[PDB]
Amino acid sequence: MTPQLQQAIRLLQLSTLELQQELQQALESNPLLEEPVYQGETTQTLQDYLMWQVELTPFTDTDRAIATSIVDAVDDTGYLTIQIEDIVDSIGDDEIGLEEVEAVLKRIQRFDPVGVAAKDLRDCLLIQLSQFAKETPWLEEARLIISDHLDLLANHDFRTLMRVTRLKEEVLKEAVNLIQSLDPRPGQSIQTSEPEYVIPDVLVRKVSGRWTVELNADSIPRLKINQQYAAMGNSARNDADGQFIRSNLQEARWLIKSLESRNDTLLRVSRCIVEQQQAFFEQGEEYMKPMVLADIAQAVEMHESTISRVTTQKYLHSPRGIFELKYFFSSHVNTEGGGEASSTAIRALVKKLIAAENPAKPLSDSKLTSMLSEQGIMVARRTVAKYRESLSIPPSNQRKQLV
Amino acid sequence: GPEEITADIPNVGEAALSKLDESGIVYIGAEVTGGDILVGKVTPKGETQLTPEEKLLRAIFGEKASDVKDSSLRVPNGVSGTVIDVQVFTRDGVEKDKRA
Amino acid sequence: KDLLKFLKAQTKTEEFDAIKIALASPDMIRSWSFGEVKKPETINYRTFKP
Amino acid sequence: MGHIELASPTAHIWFLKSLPSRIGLLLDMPLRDIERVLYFESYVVIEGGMTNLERQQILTEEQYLDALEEFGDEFDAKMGAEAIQALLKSMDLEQECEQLREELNETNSETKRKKLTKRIKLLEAFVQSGNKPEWMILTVLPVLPPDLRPLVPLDGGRFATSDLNDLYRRVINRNNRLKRLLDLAAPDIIVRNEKRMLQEA
Amino acid sequence: KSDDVNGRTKMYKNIVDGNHQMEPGMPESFNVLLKEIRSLGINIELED
DNA sequence: CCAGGGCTGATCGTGCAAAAGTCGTGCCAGCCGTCT
DNA sequence: AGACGGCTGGCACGACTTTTGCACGATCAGCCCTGG
């Protein structure tokens, strides 16, 4: 209900990154508050490698210049970004038509990774079939279904495709295999990664099947009042100086104490939500109870907001996995079996059940609802439909193909 | 994402994957030479959103386009010889233990 | 522009004859720089960008 | 490459700390006194025109304390890194060089023949080169280009930089807190200690 | 074949083509040295 | 000189109701496999 | 080849939870003034 405190207790509802940052932000204001290997080896990857080939070949000044323009618009993931006409306009010419650029852009189609800088899928695959041996049984078939009738192929249906395009069920299917064993997205062939992405907070204790309030590693912003500057307080020269020093000291003590207060709160706060939830970890990701913040403040010795703020932006970590405290929040779901359920558990089960099914005859919604009722979960058919279509799981009736 | 060591990576022929296991791990006794896949493992790259071409492409193949970034072991260019045995350590609590 | 003089004007190095050395005036150092650094932070771990 | 503002003046370490005293040969001041002035003490005098005192004398904290009330605000003096810059910028080289040459050519002796031609040659080389002595004490600080100093990519947890930008971030945050404290009218002792720490960094 | 970035590439191009010529240019170590010297209160630049 | 009353700097409390997000869950529209 | 029935996906009512702004006068012991 306080200013000098209303924030001193909202200053923790953020991540430790920002906290450190704002702590530095206010670490300059208060004088008395304080806390080789240059061998970076380089590489290539279809930008420099693509450019590398450019030089070796015999391309004239006007052609070389153009080459870089198109070799630089090649998105790393696979194909180029902008259209072809774009490229003609970004040369800055009027005498140069598409034909001139066509060649230069056609010549590159056959470099390191055959199919690099293709644009609009079809051209890529089509080219790849050109460098193949013409003494290939499904050469003409594949090509015929590459220039046209691709939409149908893309669909789950294939019978309507063969009947119209003068194709048989036996040979044509095998032509598919030569189009299927053809690798679109050749641009990632010479691609690779080397990332990390990991944050620490409250770890695990691992004591007789239990992880807890453990300890704090590196998250406490060293806030020790300076003693060389504090000695001059009592022996201040003017009134100005004394006032200054005392104001800054009191605010420093305030901040010391608020930082220490924030630590402890979240320190032992990481042992009741996660305990009220001893099924998602031990048993697994399937086996999950519904939990609510309102119910968490009821279990623990504190207010709802108090606990909501501590838990927000606090990535937890157990040898079983690292998930943010706020992500544990789940709605409700009647079950009638000694405890309600959650929709995340619906989603994981839908997914593990679509994984273990017949590949040719797909599983479904009413079927999934019935399976759930068999195990004793009793949910709606909608919740399943929603949780299925939320995970970008394609329709299972459209996921069928030729076994 | 959790890059799972599979046995069906992209941008690689079946002949090269004929030495791998069902869980993706070079059979002990194989005469691995030169630079070949030893332990398949695909890193889950942040998938995109809509972008029509991907949707069409995804359906065409499936479980490959906009999925992962192949990056296995690959015997160091200049090493050869039969592979005596392979050891495998997994974090307790992880639902795996395929070849373990 | 022309897309031809911009690419050819990339290795315009001279003979570097008569290399000398002098003091750096406080007003001449600003000509070498374009901006001014104010924050000690270099890279943020959230999205991996400066 | 970039640069740092550094509103608070700061001297250079390659000068007045090598084998020959570059700032010492221009001001005829011993190395101990110059090093003591730059460390924010000994309260050296700047001008001392009307007051009965030399322009390049030393007046300790007690000396300045008991001399300020005697001469009033006429005796101006500084006790920071900018004191040397202010004392050096107010110097006539073309007028002093002729006087020094005449004194060295007229008053010849055993010890007078040496230790005096060196200063004359230094002043002549400084005048003929067109450089300015106040340029020795810099105001801004150009930073090393970032590409030439990688971050040493580690496993991923901690970057573990090449400890070349650590001095950089230290100086940056020190100058930032100094500029923030200057706007709040801090006591003289606190701001003096802070500027001393910035000079040392 | 040691420091010059465009030099090694042009040499490779000329050897693949079959010309066997050389263009000196300027190495990168001297530029790194100039950039490291300009970082202090010292001025240095190439003249003609 | 000591205890009673007034002034004032220190020190607290880390709470509480209000507006929006979330899924149980029902309704409703479009589409395809098959027998007529 | 189209109606019938299953399948599928989009949309919305409503109970419950998530979060988010609201800046407050109130209070207690040390210090200072004063009567017994």
Swiss-Prot record, chain B:
The RNAP catalytic core consists of 2 alpha, 1 beta, 1 beta' and 1 omega subunit. When a sigma factor is associated with the core the holoenzyme is formed, which can initiate transcription. The rRNA transcription and antitermination complex (rrnTAC) consists of RNAP, NusA, NusB, NusE (rpsJ), NusG, SubB, ribosomal protein S4, DNA and precursor rRNA; S4 is more flexible than other subunits. In pull-down experiments interacts with CedA. (Microbial infection) Interacts (via flap domain) with Escherichia phage lambda antitermination protein Q; this interaction renders bacterial RNAP resistant to transcription pausing and allows it to read through termination signals. It comes from Escherichia coli (strain K12). This is DNA-directed RNA polymerase subunit beta. The chain holds residues 846 to 945 of 1342 of the full protein. Acetylated on several lysine residues in the presence of glucose. Signal peptide: none annotated. Belongs to the RNA polymerase beta chain family. DNA-dependent RNA polymerase (RNAP) catalyzes the transcription of DNA into RNA using the four ribonucleoside triphosphates as substrates. Resistance to the antibiotics salinamide A, salinamide B, rifampicin, streptolydigin, CBR703, myxopyronin, and lipiarmycin can result from mutations in this protein. Co-administration of salinamide and rifampicin or salinamide and myxopyronin suppresses the emergence of resistance to both antibiotics.
From Swiss-Prot, chain D:
It comes from the Bacteria. Acetylated on several lysine residues in the presence of glucose. Co-administration of salinamide and rifampicin or salinamide and myxopyronin suppresses the emergence of resistance to both antibiotics. Belongs to the RNA polymerase beta' chain family. DNA-dependent RNA polymerase (RNAP) catalyzes the transcription of DNA into RNA using the four ribonucleoside triphosphates as substrates. The RNAP catalytic core consists of 2 alpha, 1 beta, 1 beta' and 1 omega subunit. When a sigma factor is associated with the core the holoenzyme is formed, which can initiate transcription. The rRNA transcription and antitermination complex (rrnTAC) consists of RNAP, NusA, NusB, NusE (rpsJ), NusG, SubB, ribosomal protein S4, DNA and precursor rRNA; S4 is more flexible than other subunits. This is DNA-directed RNA polymerase subunit beta'. It comes from Escherichia coli (strain K12).
